[PDB]
């Protein structure tokens, strides 16, 4: 930042200088003829260096008499502004060593004014890590009375937007020569929105728009003077055609032929992503939709501690998915609503104050089920401290529809990851995976169903003489089938290793994308059948669970009964409480498990933020 | 690159493997009763490993009895090919210290294949840097055929069009058999899609119909039927310049399908991928050793002066009758690939007299053809240039740094497809000046470059009606105020002397206001280029002005072609002292420092009375970088 200001031997030259801003000083033209040194002098507040066009370093020019030399060079710098028009002047003479006197004189007058638009920086560059700096502006999507009104009709929505500075110190007469403007790239202008105050802090009119979809340019007025507050809002999240940066520039204009801008001042804005919250997170608050399932459903949330939410409106986790949006002012959860259409739910009964709305219509066979998210791994060389999404598809070679895969990979803080789930009926991730907490090694553990842990179960069970214990038992009457019918069905065996061979896949593609071992995988036996078509649960799904902590709902599997208890939720047990988890089965054969659905598909859970903030991610 | 294959103790397990790749191999359930040991053993060519899935690193199994645990992993590979459907074969026993014959066994048939598509890597990812690596595709935008642009055919018309493309070897080794069976599929992204095209060979090498298309537009999947065997062969070419809208990857896939589900469906077993980055388009500074010298009625001894010019810096000269400021109309840059590196022509949205030149004379053969048209501006190619290479902000740009023009924030711009093509070449990244205070407004009225044997290689020519002033004040204190300019000129422009130019009151604050606005772009390039005063040059110049406009006094010195040593410099008529222009030897006094020759060109009736100078009407190609951009690491 450095501005050359030429002064004249036959004239004095006028110049407006900004705060800290360097200026060099040179002439027009040769110096006096027989010029062998010069002085030069400076108002109190005027700081004038001496230095070599080679050098880094500065040095107090005022108190010598330096011989001349045309490659050194004067710098001059004013840190505080001004209180009248040419409040100060550098006086540069020039001296021989052939007469006593000056041979000339060289004034210039300078007029300094302090103009800076700052923001809370955590000038023109943002950048990620531990070394971070930048503002991060929210989108505001919720109803605090909002992302859609041209007013601030409301008296905490301004706790959800970021502030903005514009320091304007100086004379006031400078300004009826100069001209303040504050403006935005049009992009970025229907990207956010921007409100001045005037009536500070007390009325909602206060605060009128005046950055918006139209207007890219405001003449800021100097309402309070030395300072200007102004209030930003985010309009829209990362997508494939938005990088997620907003610029807002501040100019001082020489007001002939035009305004001709002197100085420019920037603030860089970075939109804050949408990050989702897996199952390992402490929950918050359960939500469900004959149903003897709210019962239980309510006395495990009792026992694990959340609230919960009944609605008669007729899967409730495949509609909507709870994430958050965080900033150092305020961080809210916001929700993303699925393409399936509950589809009034979300935007009806989900919006409350500190609660924002995303959806991406496609204006359709993937729902909010099959989106997770893994807990913070390592893999790849490279960290992920929020985890990383994880969604259905095919192999290379029935995907989710593209606005919603470009809105994930554009929040660029948990990369996600495409798994095999085509070959599911309905194709859902909680089908076949889910994560726990664990207290040992990576603070968790992934759940994956096998039809191969279910082979060795009930033949382990088979070789002691219970192969006569029958599945499906303890049901309203659908078939009762017993071990021995089970394994000697030859298409069945088939096809479940079919299944096995799929789950296998996904198994070795989220050790390699996660970076987890086999000491970390929890195989969970599940059968599965077909209607000459895809999969789908033969027994309801174990691995399709609600997680709240230390308290996990698990589908009642009601298989084969061996000492009056059924030996699949033994071996749950066997399975999760080494884990010291505890595991409440619920009585899911009624409601939910012959409509392809289980505990985890028919309730949501929002859950408490990640510790470790965004910025630091270091994509 | 794992793959998990469980095999079955009441049946055999049959099963297609890929060379290389490692198959983990564990049972459904099972697990004989006793079992307390197990044995594993392989076909020849078949490579058994024994690892726990908690400590990486292998062993070999098939020479001891292991003790049975489920925390163990058994790993096949197979580098090999098969000759047969299933030539290899890994049995499991498994074994008790009960009864001495085995519980039971398991039985696995493997069939390997040796598929995989690879090209020149100088496979999933490209990487900047000294340690990078990936195939680099050109875009071929030339007419290589003497028959007719070569980019929008869809045969190969030519024997050496080829040349320019990238080879694509595509390895399918194994059992004929097998693929009676199993299908290979050739595929791309639709968008990647409409980005290039592939060809692939039938006959190879002879005939120009042997190249069939089959990726483009329309095809995103083909079938390769394996003529040549084991190995067929594609050439692929690019068809589109990075931009705003193309980020420059181009990336082909090779699938194998077990189609042996005749009713079902086919089923992906193993996928590979060749990743290629479209080679971006390079600009060259005067810095450069020059090549040939482009020239463009009532013309006069100044063609004479360029061709006496080249004929001393050795470089071709093209004459060009065609008018109804060759500089303003192309700029000359190349791409480069480690095949084939051939200069590629850029053409100007400025059109109207040399609008068809480049795509009729300068299309040779190996010599490309980039133009984005609009849907406007005052600027134009004579405002393209570009610096040497240099070091700034912190970061190194070894091939230098784009420069072009435009105003502070407050209009005149270069159109936005232009900004977004040169934007986008991420190689050379441009730096906007202020040059809207010019009448026409081009970068080479007040910038230049020159080559300087000491210093940082170079040095930054900027006019300066400040040196014009310390020239004739200096010049009028030995009494020589009386000098006229313009005296050895054709006249009706009114011959002026020193004391009437220095006593003008309007014109020297004028031309302090200019000085003013290249101060500004001094500071600027000193900032963006990480120049300092030692590499810069004031040559004096001033400016006229019809109340809104700028143009040369007289004859603009920094608007001169410089071809390595040999510069040529407008001759400015200045005010004549001994016999000679001061102003020419104040030019002199500058430059020949440097070691170059100064040779100033009569050019006063047909350019500057246009607004131009020599650099705006003659144009010059360049010896490219020896710096290869894929280093760059942007
Ligand atoms: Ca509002
Ligand atoms: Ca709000
Ligand atoms: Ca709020
Ligand atoms: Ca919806
Ligand atoms: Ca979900
Ligand atoms: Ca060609
Ligand atoms: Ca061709
Ligand atoms: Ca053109
Ligand atoms: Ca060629
Ligand atoms: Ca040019
Ligand atoms: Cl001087
Ligand atoms: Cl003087
Ligand atoms: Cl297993
Ligand atoms: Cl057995």
Redesign the pocket.
Known sequence: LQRIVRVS?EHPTSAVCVAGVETLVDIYG?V??GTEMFEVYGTPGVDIYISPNMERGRERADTRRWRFDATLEIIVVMNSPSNDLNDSHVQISYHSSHEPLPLAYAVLYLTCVDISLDCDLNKRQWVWGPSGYGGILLVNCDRDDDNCDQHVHCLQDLEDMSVMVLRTQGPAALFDDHKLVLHTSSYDAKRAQVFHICGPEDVCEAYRHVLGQDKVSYEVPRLHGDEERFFVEGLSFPDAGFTGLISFHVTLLDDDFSASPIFTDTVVFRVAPWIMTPSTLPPLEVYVCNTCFVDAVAELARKAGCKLTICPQAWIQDEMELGYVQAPHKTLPVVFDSPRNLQDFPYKRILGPDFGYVTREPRGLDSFGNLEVSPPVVANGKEYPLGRILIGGNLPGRRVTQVVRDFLHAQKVQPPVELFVDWLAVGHVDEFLSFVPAPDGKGFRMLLASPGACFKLFQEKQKCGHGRALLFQGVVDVKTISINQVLSNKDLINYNKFVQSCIDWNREVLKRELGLAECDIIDIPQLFKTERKKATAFFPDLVNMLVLGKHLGIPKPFGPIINGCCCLEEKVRSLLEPLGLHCTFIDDFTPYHMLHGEVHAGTNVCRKPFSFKWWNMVP
Do not use: A, F, R
């Open positions: 031997l040769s006096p003829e």
